Coordinates of C-alpha atoms and ligand atoms in Angstrom, one line a residue:
Chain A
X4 CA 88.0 90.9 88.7
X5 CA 91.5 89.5 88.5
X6 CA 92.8 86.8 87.2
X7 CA 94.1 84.0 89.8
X8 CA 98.1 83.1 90.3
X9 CA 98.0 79.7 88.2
X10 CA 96.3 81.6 85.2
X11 CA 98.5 84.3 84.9
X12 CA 101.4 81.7 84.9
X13 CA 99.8 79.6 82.4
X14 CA 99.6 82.4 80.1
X15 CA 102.6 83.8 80.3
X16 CA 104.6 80.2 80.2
X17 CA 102.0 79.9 76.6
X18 CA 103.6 83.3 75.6
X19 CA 106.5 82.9 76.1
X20 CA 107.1 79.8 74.0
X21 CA 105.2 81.0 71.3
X22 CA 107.6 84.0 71.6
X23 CA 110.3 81.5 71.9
X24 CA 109.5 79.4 68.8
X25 CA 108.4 82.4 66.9
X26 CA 112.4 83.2 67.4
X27 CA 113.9 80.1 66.9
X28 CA 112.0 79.7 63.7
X29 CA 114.2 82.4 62.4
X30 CA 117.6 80.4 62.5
X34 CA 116.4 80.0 53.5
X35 CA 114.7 79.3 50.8
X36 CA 114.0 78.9 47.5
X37 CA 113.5 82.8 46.4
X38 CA 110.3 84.5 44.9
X39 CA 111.0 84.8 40.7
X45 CA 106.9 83.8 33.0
X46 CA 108.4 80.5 32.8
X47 CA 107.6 76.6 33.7
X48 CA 110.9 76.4 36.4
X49 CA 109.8 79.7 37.4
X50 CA 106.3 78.5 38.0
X51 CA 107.1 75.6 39.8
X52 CA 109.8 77.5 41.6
X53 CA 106.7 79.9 43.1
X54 CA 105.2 76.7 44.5
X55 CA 108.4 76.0 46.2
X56 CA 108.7 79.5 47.5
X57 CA 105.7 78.6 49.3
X58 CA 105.4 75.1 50.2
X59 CA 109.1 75.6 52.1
X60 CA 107.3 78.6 54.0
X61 CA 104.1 76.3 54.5
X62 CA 107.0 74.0 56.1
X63 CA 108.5 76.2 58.2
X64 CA 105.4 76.8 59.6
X65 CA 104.2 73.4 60.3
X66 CA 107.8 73.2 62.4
X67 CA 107.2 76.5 64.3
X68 CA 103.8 74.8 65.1
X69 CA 104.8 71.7 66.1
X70 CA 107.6 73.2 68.2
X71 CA 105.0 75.2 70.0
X72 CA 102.6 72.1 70.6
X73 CA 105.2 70.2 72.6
X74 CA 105.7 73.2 75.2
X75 CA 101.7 73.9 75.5
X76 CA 101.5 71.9 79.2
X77 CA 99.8 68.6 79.3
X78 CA 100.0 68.2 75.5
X79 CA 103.3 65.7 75.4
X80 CA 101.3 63.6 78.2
X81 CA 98.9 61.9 75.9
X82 CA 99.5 58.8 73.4
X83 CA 102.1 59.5 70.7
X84 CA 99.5 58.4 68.4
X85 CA 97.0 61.5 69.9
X86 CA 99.2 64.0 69.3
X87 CA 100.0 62.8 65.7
X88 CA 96.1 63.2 65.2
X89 CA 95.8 66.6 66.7
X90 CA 98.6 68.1 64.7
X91 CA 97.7 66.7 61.9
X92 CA 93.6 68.1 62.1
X93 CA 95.0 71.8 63.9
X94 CA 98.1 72.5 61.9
X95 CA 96.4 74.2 58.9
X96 CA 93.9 76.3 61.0
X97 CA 96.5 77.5 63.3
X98 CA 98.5 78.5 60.4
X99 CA 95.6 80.5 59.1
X100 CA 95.5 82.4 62.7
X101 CA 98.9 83.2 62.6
X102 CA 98.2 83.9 58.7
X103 CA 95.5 86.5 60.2
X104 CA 98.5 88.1 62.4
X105 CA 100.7 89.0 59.0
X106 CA 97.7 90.4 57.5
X107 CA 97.5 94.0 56.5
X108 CA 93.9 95.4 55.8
X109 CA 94.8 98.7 53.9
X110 CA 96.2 96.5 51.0
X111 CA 94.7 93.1 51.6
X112 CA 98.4 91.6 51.5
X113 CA 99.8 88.8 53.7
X114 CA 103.6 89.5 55.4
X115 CA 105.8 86.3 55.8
X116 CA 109.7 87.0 55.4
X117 CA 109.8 90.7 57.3
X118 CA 109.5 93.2 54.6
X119 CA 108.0 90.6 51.8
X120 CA 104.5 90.9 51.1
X121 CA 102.2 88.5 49.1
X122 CA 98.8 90.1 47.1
X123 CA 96.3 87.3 46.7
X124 CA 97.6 87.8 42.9
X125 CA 100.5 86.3 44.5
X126 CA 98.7 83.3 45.8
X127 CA 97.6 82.5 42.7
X128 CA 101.0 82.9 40.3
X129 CA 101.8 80.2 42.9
X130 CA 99.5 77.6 42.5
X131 CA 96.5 78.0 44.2
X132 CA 92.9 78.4 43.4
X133 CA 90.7 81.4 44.1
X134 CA 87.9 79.4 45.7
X135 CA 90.8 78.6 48.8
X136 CA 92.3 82.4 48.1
X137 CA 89.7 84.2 48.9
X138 CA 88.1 82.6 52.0
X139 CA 91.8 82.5 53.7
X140 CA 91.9 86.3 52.5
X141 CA 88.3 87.0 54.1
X142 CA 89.2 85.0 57.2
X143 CA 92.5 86.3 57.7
X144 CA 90.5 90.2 57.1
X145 CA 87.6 89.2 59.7
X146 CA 89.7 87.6 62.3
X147 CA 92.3 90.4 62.2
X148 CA 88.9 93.1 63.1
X149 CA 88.8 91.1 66.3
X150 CA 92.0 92.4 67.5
X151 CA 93.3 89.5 69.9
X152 CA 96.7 90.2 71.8
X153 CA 99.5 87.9 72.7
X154 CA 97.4 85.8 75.7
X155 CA 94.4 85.9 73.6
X156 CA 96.1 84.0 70.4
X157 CA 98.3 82.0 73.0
X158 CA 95.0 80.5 74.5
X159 CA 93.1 80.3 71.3
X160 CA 95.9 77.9 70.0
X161 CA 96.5 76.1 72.6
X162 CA 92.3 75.0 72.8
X163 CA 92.6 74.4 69.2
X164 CA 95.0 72.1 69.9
X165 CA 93.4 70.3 72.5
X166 CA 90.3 69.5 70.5
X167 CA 88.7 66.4 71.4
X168 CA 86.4 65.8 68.1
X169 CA 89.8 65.2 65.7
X170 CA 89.9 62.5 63.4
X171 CA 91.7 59.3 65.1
X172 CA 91.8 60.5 68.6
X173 CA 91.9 57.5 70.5
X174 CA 91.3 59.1 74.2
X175 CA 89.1 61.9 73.3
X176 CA 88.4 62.3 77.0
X177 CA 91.7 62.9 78.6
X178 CA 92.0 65.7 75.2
X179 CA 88.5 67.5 76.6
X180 CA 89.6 67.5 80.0
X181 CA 93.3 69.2 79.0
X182 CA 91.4 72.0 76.9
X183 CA 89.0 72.8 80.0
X184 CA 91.5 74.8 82.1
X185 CA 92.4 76.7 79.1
X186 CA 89.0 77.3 77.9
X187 CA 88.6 78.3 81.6
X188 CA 91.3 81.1 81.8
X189 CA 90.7 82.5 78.2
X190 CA 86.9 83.2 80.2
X191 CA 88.8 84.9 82.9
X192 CA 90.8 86.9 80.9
X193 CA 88.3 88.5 78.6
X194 CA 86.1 88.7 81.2
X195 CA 88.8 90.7 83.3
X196 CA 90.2 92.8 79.9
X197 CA 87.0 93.6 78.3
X198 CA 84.6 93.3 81.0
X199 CA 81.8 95.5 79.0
X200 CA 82.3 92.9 76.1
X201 CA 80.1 90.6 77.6
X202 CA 80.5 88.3 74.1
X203 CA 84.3 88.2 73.0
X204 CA 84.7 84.8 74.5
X205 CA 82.1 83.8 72.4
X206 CA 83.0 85.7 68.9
X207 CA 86.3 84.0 70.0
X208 CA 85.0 80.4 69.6
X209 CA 83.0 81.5 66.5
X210 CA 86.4 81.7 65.0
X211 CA 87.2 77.9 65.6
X212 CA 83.9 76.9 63.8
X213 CA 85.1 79.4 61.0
X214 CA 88.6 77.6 61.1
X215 CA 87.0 74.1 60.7
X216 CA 85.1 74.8 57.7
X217 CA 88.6 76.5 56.4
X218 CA 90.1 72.9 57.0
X219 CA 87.4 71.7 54.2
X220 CA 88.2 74.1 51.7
X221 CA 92.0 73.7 52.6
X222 CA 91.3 69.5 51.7
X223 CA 90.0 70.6 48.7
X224 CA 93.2 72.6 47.2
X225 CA 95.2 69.5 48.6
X226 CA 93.7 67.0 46.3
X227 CA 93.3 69.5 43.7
X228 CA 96.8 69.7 43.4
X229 CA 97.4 66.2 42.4
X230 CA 95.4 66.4 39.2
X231 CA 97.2 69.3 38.4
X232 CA 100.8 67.0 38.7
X233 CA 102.0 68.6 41.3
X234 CA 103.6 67.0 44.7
X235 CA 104.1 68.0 48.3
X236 CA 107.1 67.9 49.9
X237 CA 107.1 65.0 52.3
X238 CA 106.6 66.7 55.8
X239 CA 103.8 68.5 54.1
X240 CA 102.6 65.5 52.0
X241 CA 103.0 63.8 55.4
X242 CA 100.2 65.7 57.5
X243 CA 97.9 66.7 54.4
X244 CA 97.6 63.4 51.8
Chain B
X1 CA 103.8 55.6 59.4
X2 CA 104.2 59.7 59.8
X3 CA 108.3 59.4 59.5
X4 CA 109.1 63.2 59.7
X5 CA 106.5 64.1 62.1
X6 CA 107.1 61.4 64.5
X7 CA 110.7 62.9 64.5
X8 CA 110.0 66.8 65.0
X9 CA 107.8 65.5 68.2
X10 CA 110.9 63.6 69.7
X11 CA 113.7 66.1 68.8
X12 CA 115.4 66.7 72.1
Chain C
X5 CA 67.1 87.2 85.3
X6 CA 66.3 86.8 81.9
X7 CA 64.8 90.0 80.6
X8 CA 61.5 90.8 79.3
X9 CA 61.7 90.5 76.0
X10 CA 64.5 87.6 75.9
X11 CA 62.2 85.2 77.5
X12 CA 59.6 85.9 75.3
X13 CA 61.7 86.0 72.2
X14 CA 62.3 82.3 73.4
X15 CA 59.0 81.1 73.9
X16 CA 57.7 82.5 71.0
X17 CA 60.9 80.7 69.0
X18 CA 59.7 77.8 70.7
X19 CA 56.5 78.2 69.4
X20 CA 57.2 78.4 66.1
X21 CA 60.0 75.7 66.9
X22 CA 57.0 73.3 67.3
X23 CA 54.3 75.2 65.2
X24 CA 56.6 73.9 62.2
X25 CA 57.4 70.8 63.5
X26 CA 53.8 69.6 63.8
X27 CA 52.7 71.0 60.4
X33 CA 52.8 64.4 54.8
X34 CA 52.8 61.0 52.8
X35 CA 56.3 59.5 51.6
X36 CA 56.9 56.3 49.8
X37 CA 56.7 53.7 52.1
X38 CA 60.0 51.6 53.6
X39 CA 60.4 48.4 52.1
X40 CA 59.6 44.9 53.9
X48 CA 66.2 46.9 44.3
X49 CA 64.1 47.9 47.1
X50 CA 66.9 49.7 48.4
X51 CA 66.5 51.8 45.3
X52 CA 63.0 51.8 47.6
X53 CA 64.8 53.2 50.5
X54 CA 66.9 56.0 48.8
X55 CA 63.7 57.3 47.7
X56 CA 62.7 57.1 51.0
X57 CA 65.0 59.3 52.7
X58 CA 65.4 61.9 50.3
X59 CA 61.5 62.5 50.6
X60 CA 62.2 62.3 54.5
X61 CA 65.2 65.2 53.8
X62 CA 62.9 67.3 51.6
X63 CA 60.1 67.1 53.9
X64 CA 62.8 69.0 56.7
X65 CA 63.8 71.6 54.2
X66 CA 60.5 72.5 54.2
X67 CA 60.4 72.7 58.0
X68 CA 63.8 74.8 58.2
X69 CA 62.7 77.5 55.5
X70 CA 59.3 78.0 57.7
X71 CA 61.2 78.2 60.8
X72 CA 64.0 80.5 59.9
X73 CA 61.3 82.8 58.1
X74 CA 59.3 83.4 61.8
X75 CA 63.0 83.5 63.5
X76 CA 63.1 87.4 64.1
X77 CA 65.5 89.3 61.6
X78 CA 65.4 86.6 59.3
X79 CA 63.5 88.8 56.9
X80 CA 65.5 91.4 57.2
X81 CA 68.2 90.0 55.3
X82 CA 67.9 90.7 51.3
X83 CA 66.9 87.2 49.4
X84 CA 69.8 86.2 48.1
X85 CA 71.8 86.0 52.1
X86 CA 69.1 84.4 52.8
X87 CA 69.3 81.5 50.5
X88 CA 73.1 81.8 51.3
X89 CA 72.0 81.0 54.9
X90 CA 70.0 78.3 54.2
X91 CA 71.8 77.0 51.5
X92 CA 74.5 76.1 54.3
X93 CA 72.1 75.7 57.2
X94 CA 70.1 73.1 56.2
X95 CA 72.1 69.9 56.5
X96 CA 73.5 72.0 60.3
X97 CA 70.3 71.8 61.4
X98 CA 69.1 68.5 59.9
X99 CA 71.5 67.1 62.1
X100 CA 70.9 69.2 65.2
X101 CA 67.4 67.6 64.1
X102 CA 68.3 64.5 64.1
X103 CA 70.0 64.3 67.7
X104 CA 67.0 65.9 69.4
X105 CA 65.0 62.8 68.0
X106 CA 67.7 60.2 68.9
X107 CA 66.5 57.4 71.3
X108 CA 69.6 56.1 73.3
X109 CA 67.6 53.1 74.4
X110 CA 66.7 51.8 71.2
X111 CA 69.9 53.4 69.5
X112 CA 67.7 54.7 67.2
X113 CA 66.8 58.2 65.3
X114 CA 63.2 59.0 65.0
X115 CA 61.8 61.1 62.2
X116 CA 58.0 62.0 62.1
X117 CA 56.1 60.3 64.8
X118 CA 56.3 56.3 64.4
X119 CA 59.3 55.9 61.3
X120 CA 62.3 54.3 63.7
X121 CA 66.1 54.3 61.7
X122 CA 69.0 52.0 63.5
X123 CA 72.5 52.3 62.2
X124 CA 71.4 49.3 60.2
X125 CA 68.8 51.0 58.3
X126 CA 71.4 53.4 57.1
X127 CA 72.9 51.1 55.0
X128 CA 70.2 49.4 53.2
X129 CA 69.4 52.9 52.3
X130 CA 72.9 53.1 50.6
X131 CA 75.5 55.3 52.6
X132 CA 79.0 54.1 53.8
X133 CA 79.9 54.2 57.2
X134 CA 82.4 57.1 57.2
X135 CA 78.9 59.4 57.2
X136 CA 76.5 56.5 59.0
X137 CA 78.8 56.7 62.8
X138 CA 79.5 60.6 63.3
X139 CA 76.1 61.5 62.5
X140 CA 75.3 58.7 65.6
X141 CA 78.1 59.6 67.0
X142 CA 77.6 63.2 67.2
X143 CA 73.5 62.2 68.7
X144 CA 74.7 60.8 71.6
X145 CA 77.5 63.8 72.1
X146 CA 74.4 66.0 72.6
X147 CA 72.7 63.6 74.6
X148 CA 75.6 64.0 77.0
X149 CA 74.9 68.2 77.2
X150 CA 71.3 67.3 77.3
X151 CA 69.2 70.5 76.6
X152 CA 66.1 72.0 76.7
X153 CA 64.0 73.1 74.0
X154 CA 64.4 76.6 74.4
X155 CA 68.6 75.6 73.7
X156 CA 67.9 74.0 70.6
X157 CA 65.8 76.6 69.5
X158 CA 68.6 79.2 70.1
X159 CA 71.0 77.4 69.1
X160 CA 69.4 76.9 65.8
X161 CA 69.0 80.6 65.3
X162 CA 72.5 81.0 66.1
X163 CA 73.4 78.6 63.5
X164 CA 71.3 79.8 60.6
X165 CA 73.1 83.7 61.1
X166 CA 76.5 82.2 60.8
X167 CA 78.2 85.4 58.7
X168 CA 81.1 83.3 57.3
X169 CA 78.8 81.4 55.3
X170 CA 79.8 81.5 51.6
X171 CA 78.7 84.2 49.7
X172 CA 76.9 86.4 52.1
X173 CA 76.5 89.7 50.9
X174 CA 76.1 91.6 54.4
X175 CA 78.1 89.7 56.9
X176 CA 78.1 92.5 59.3
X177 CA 74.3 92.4 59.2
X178 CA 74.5 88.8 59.4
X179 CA 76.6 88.9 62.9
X180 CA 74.4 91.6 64.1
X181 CA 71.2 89.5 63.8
X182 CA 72.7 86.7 65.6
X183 CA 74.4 89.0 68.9
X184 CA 71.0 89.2 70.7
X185 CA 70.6 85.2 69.8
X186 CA 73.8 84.2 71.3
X187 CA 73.0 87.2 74.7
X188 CA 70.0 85.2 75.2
X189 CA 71.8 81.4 75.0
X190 CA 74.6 82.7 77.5
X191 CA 71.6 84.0 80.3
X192 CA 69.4 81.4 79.7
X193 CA 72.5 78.7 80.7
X194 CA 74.3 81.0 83.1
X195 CA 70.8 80.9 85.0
X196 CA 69.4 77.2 83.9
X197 CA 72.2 76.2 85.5
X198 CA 74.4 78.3 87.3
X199 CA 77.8 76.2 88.5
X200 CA 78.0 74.4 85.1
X201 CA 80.7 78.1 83.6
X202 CA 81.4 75.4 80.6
X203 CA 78.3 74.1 79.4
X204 CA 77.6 77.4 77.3
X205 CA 81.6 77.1 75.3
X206 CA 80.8 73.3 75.0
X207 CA 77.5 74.1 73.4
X208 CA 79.0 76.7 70.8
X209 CA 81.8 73.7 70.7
X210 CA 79.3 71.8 68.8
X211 CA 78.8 74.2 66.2
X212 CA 82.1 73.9 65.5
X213 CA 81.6 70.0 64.7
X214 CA 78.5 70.5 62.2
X215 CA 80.7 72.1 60.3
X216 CA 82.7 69.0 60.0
X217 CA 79.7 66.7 59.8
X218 CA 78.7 69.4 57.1
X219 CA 82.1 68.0 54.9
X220 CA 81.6 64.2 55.7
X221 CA 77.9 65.0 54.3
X222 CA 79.6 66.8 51.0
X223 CA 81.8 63.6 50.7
X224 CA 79.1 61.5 50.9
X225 CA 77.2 63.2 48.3
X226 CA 79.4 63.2 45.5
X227 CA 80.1 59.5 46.5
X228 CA 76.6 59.2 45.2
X229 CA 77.8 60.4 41.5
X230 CA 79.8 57.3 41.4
X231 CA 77.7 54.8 43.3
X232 CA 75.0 56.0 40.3
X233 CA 72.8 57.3 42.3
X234 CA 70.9 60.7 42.0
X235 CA 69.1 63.3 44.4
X236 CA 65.2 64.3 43.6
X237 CA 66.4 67.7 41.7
X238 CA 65.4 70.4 44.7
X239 CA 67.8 68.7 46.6
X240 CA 70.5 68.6 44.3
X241 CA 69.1 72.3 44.0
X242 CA 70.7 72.5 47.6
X243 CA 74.0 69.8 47.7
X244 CA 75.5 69.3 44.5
X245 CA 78.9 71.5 43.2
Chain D
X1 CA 69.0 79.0 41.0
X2 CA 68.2 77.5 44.0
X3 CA 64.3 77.0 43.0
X4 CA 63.3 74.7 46.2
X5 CA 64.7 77.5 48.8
X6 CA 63.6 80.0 46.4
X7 CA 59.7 78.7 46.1
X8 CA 60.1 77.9 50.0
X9 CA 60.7 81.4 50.4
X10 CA 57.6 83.4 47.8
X11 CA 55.3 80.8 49.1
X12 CA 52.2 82.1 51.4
Ligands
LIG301 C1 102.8 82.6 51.5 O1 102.4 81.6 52.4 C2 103.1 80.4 52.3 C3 102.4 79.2 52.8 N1 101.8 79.4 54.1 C4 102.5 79.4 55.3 C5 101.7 79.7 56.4 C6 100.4 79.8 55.9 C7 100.5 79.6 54.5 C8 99.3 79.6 53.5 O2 99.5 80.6 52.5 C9 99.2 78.2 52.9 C10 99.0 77.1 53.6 C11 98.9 75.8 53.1 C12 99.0 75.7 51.7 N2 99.0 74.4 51.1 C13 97.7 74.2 50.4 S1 100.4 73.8 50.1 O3 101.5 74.0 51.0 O4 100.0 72.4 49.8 C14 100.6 74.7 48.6 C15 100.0 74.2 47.4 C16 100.2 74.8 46.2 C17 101.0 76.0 46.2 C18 101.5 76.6 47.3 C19 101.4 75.9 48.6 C20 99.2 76.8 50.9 C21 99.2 78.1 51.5 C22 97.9 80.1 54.1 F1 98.0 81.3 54.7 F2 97.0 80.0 53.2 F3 97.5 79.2 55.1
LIG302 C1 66.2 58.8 57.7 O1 66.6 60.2 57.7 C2 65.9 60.9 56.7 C3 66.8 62.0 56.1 N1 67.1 63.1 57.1 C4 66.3 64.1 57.4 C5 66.8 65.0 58.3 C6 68.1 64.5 58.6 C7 68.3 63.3 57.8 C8 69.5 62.4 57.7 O2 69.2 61.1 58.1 C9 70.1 62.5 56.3 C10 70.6 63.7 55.8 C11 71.1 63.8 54.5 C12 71.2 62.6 53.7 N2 71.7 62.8 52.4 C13 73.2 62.4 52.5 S1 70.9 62.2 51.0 O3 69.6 62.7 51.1 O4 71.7 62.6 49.9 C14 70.8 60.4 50.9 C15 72.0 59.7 50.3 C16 71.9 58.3 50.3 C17 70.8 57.6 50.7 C18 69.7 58.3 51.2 C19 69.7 59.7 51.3 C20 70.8 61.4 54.2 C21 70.3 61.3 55.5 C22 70.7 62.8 58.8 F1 70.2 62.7 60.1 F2 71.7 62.0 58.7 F3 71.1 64.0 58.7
LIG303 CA1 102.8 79.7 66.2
LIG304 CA1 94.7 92.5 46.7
LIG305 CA1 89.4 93.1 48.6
LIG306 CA1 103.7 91.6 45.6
LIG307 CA1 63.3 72.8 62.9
LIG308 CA1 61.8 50.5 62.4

């Protein structure tokens, strides 16, 4: 009924880096604006946020314990299959319910209409918007998204992972304390672990449709900015 | 292969 | 410690998990005949949509659902549980998958029957990962059910139904491994951990289909009904 | 739409 000296230092170490990149994350770009720069501009507007992002991600992977440890050719495949899905979960933290908008800047708030003055499609708009609205019910705190990202990261079944078994065997002690914890903060919710995980499977699927909007865009003459281009081409 | 990446993962 | 009604819930999924399985004549594998041998399979994947619709309509709650979630369901089930399927019949002594009582399939096979590998080694692949977790039938079976009442699946109407239907499903898989076997804490997240790769074997399945509508190649209608965008 | 699933369904 408590959790044991290591866990509650793993969490807190976890939350405090994500508290520390969330930060340093914060220390420009091309503003919000109809027009063909004005267009293409809105796709900046976004792809620089998708960028910042990507970097607040990355800079969080390389302080999750253990993660730095494997191949440099490992951690290029598990940023490269988790970066999207864990931007979708921190997505799910900006969004607002009451008006179905997602926050990004601090008082700037994107409508799905939004979304789509920028360049994207409704079949990706409205399955981020429905995941972002369903995981956001669930109502996970700082340790619970901490840990969530952190076994994302560590997933062995990635694309390209050339020592799948040294990644299964970093994710167990953190599959083990997110147990303990909802176990010990929601003891009567004998299944939150579980709806926890459900979100993963929801995430991968998300990955699919995300794919799809990626190659979508190059029919449409259209080009990623290299970092982004990078992980998603 | 993965230029920009392979930076951000060794910055520091 | 399983309660009353769980355990029977299970065996009487098991039941029908085998009361559908049991429950036809294909054209034969050759000896263009690969033209022979997608025929082959296709009549092979038809035959298991048949066996998935009778299951999931004597899985409890099933019916409960309005028809058009539950051809959402299915729609996005079927190829999940194919493969779920497919692993419960792989043989890791002759590396080989096993479809109706005698038909044997290699890796080989898979390509005279005209796929590219980038489908023909996860699905192997992702046999032998179960193999490792080994279950029992009774695991499957729930696991199946918790599969076929995924709520995220496109264009449910009643998702909140949906995730209600498949609570007492998932109670009943956490017991039955808690007890099963008590020290093992992980098996249950690793066996949820799979549903989270059929979803990805669910995409490498859509890219290998519409690979098909280049290779000139098309599915029987019903399941084009079911695979084509 | 969806005639296999949808015959699988009625039938019996
Ligand atoms: C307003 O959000 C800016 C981008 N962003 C940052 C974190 C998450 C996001 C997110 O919107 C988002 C994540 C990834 C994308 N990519 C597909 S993209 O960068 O190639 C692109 C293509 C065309 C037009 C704009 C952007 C788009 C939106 C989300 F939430 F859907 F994941
Ligand atoms: C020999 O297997 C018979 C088909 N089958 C039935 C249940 C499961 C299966 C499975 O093999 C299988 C599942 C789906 C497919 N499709 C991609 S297909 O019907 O469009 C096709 C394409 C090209 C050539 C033949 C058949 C193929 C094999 C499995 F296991 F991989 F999922
Ligand atoms: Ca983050
Ligand atoms: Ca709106
Ligand atoms: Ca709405
Ligand atoms: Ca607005
Ligand atoms: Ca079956
Ligand atoms: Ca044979």
């Amino acid at each position: 009924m408590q959790l044991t000296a290591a866990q509650e230092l793993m969490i807190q170490q976890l939350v405090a880096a994500q508290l520390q990149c969330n930060k340093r994350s914060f220390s420009k770009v091309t503003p919000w604006p109809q027009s063909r720069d004005a267009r293409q501009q809105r796709f900046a507007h976004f792809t620089e946020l998708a960028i910042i992002s990507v970097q607040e991600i990355v800079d969080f992977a390389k302080q999750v314990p253990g993660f730095l440890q494997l191949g440099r050719e490992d951690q290029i495949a598990l940023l490269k299959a988790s970066t999207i899905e864990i931007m979708l979960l921190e997505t799910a933290r900006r969004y607002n319910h009451e008006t179905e908008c997602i926050t990004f800047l601090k008082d700037f708030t994107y409508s799905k209409d939004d979304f789509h003055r920028a360049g994207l499609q409704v079949e990706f708009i409205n399955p981020i918007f429905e995941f972002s609205r369903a995981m956001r019910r669930l109502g996970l705190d700082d340790a619970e998204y901490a840990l969530l990202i952190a076994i994302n990261i560590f997933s062995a079944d990635r694309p390209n992972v050339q020592e799948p078994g040294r990644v299964e065997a970093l994710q167990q002690p953190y599959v083990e304390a997110l147990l303990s914890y909802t176990r010990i903060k929601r003891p009567q919710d004998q299944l939150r672990f579980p709806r926890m995980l459900m979100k993963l499977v929801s995430l991968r699927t998300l990955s699919s449709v995300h794919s799809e909007q990626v190659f979508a865009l190059r029919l449409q003459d259209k080009k990623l900015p290299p970092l982004l281009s990078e992980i998603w081409d | 292969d993965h230029q920009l990446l392979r930076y951000l993962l060794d910055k520091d």
